[PDB]
Design a protein around this ligand. Structure first.
Ligand code: HEM
Ligand SMILES: [C-]#N
Length: 146
């Protein structure tokens, strides 16, 4: 887990992002797709589609919302190694079954701090907390067989 201090920093940087969950969450998805085009092929709904197609799909909102809803719960529980264990196991089990692996989560980690900053400048120490939070997911995915 993160320490209470780091988790506080991550929550602080996430606040302004989550404040506009519909829009920011669709934006996160599109950024992902722009930067790491192969990601899209993991989704049944967007396999083969171009970013333009993705942005115009009526399915986008459901996908971004579920990521944001779940990410929010990770942020909230990040300092409780207890809940983190449970959350990460499930999260990884779910993903691996869909063919998604840690490399795709390395990609998310790479671009996340840049994405948060696109909304509001994060406090000192926040980027590192996010990178350690995503490092934990990456590790759970490796544990799950990918
Ligand atoms: C960044 C944070 C992410 C979070 C919080 C997240 C969250 C979720 C959750 C909540 C579900 C629905 C699980 C269920 O109820 O069965 C799931 C589905 C899925 N996610 Fe993620 N996800 C993340 C990133 C990824 C990435 C990077 C990929 C693809 C590269 C991925 C691909 C999938 C697929 C393919 C499934 C379900 C089937 C599908 O829609 O095709 N997710 N994810
Ligand atoms: C995948 N959300």
């Amino acid at each position: 887990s993160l320490s209470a201090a780091e988790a506080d920093l991550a929550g602080k940087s996430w606040a302004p992002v989550f404040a506009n969950k519909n829009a920011n969450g669709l934006d996160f998805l599109v950024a992902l797709f722009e930067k790491f085009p192969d990601s899209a092929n993991f989704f049944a709904d967007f396999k083969g589609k171009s970013v333009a197609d993705i942005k115009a799909s009526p399915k986008l909102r459901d996908v971004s919302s579920r990521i944001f809803t779940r990410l929010n719960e990770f942020v909230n529980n990040a300092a409780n190694a207890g809940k983190m264990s449970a959350m990460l196991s499930q999260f990884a089990k779910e993903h691996v079954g869909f063919g998604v692996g840690s490399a795709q989560f390395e990609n998310v980690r790479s671009m996340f701090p840049g994405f948060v900053a696109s909304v509001a400048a994060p406090p000192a120490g926040a980027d590192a907390a996010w990178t350690k939070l995503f490092g934990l997911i990456i590790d759970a995915l490796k544990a799950a067989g990918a």
